[PDB]
């Protein structure tokens, strides 16, 4: 007899309520105020051109059929009330497979302020699509987007807006930084109108500025390719008469160079254009191949030392240093 007062209020709101109609269907345009709390920015798969994000997708609108007078103002209600009322059909434009978490109860809440203001948050993991242009691999930077808007309601019915200021309407938690390869720099939001065959919809887009950390590929591709060149350029310091010895240098360095040429592109997609790493590999391929034809030159020609070996001892280490000085200068800036 002390909790039946709140039982009367909840049945009073849903009596005569039609949840198939947006509020102000014949009067106004339903403004949906939205803000995103990112609990953990998950990993970026650069093979699928996708990324995973865990959000607290908050929404807010005003319904004039849910006014009430009671003891308390905020009604921190349960989850199953939300399916009994009107909710906007917000979907992600570039989502691929997003999951609403259901353990143990569904991870949604619903607060009904006594003037008719609703707050409807949910916990979603979103596997959105991030189109990439890997022409500066691995020193590239990306702007991974996240576009969302209504599905069945046009811009004359449902419009979207941010709750707080657009600078601080997408908040990233400090502890959630599940990127292991990329590095999150900042977030930028925007809003516009899209055009479709059915009509004009309001779309909300939040870009994620990412920058790849080079340090994995230094100790995986760059340093072993550099040390292969030094392994290939030690052949100029031997004698001219070590034909089986120098041909081990001339074959095993170029045989191990094409293995790293294959194995550096396995995690990459099958893109048509050549990446910036492949230009470093091909010049390093060209430096270890010109060392092999250097030995084939001196083998064709009391045996004194050669002018070819006395010049390639100085030129080939120097000319690799000129390339390495200009490659890291023009792709790190």
């Amino acid at each position: 007899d002390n909790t039946t007062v709140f039982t009367r209020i909840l049945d009073r709101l849903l009596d005569g309520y039609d949840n198939r109609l947006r509020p102000g269907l014949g009067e106004r345009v339903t403004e949906v105020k939205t803000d995103i709390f990112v609990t953990s920015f998950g990993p970026v798969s650069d093979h699928d051109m996708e990324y995973t994000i865990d959000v607290f997708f908050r929404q807010s609108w005003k319904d004039e059929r849910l006014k009430f007078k009671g003891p308390m103002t905020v009604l921190r209600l349960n989850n199953l009330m939300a399916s009994k009322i009107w909710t906007p059909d917000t979907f992600f434009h570039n989502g691929k497979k997003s999951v609403a978490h259901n353990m143990t109860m569904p991870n949604k809440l619903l607060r009904i302020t006594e003037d008719g203001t609703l707050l409807y948050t949910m916990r979603l993991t979103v596997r959105a699509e991030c189109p990439m242009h890997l022409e500066d691999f691995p020193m590239d930077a990306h702007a991974c987007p996240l576009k969302f808007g209504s599905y069945a309601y046009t811009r004359a019915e449902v419009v979207y807006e941010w709750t707080r200021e657009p600078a601080r309407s997408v908040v990233v938690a400090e502890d959630g930084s599940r990127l292991n390869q990329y590095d999150l720099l900042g977030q930028t939001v925007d809003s516009g109108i899209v055009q479709s065959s059915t009509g004009e919809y309001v779309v909300m887009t939040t870009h994620f500025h990412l920058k790849r950390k080079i340090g994995y590929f230094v100790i995986q591709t760059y340093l072993p390719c550099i040390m292969t060149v030094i392994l290939s350029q030690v052949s100029f310091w031997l004698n001219r008469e070590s034909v089986p010895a120098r041909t081990v240098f001339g074959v095993t360095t170029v045989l191990t160079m094409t293995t790293l040429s294959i194995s550096a592109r396995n995690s990459l997609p099958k893109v048509a254009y050549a990446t910036a790493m492949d230009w470093f590999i091909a010049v390093c391929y060209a430096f270890v191949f010109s060392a092999l034809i250097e030995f084939a030159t001196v083998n064709y020609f009391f045996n004194s030392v050669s002018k070819i070996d006395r010049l390639s001892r100085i030129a080939f280490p120097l000319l690799f240093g000129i390339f390495n000085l200009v490659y890291w200068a023009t792709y790190l800036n």
Partner: antibody, heavy 117, light 106 residues
Framework: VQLQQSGAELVKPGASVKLSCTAS????????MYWVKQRPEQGLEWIGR????????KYDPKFQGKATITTDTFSNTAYLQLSSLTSEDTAVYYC???????????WGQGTSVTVST | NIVMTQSPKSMSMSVGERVTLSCKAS??????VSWYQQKPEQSPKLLIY???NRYTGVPDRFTGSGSATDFTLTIGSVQAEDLADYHC????????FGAGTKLELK
């Protein structure tokens, strides 16, 4: 719809002044309240903002500790509070609300303060 | 903080030709850039909310252009009722304003 402000006043330097912005046709709890400083022959200057749902307040870094805003939902009016006013701040104060795309669609008529002898 | 630079300070053209206002931001503001006019000794009104999105009531000769940094306000034909200075505000952060841009008629 219609935004109303009180009339102009004459104050001495170093005193305190109260200025009001009455809103009609719409409640304050769902839209922000913006106040902006308009000097003569000069551009605008935003000074602060109000979220009346929770009483949140954020000021301009220049006007920190200079102005204070209280808001009454029942009176449908927001209030200025200029504690330490000097003779340099002789201008007109305008009232505003948040528009469709965070613009300021509806503006008050403006109240001019005059700090002189 | 965000600063908005409105160029030029003033101009003077006759009735019924092309005028191009300018407003450039310090850093990235996406679309939330507002245009306000100020008729002398009245209240400001709103011309374009957002970038390139006309408000209701103003004529169709007013138009805008949006980008990441630079924003242009264009009137196809200057009329006799446009004696005001135009202010360029922003709303991606806490709002700031430019210095305005006066105009005069012969």
């Amino acid at each position: 719809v219609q935004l109303q402000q009180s009339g102009a006043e004459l104050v001495k330097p170093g005193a305190s002044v109260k200025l009001s912005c009455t809103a009609s046709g719409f409640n304050i709890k769902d839209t922000y309240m913006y106040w902006v400083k308009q000097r003569p022959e000069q551009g605008l200057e935003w000074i602060g903002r109000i979220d009346p749902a929770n009483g949140d307040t954020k000021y301009d870094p220049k006007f920190q500790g200079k102005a204070t805003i209280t808001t009454d939902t029942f009176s449908n009016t927001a209030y200025l509070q200029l504690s330490s006013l000097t003779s340099e701040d002789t201008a007109v104060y305008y009232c505003a609300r948040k528009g469709l795309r965070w613009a300021m669609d509806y503006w008050g008529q403006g109240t001019s303060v005059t700090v002189s002898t | 903080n965000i600063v908005m630079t409105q160029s030029p300070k003033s101009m003077s053209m006759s009735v019924g030709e092309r005028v191009t206002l300018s407003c450039k931001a310090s850093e990235y503001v996406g679309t939330y850039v507002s245009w306000y006019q100020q008729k002398p000794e009245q209240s400001p009104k709103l011309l374009i909310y957002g970038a390139s999105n006309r408000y209701t009531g103003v004529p169709d000769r007013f138009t805008g252009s949006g980008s990441a940094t630079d924003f242009t306000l264009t009137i196809g034909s200057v009329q006799a009722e446009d004696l005001a200075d135009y202010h360029c505000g922003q709303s991606y952060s806490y709002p700031t304003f430019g210095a305005g841009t006066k105009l005069e008629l012969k």
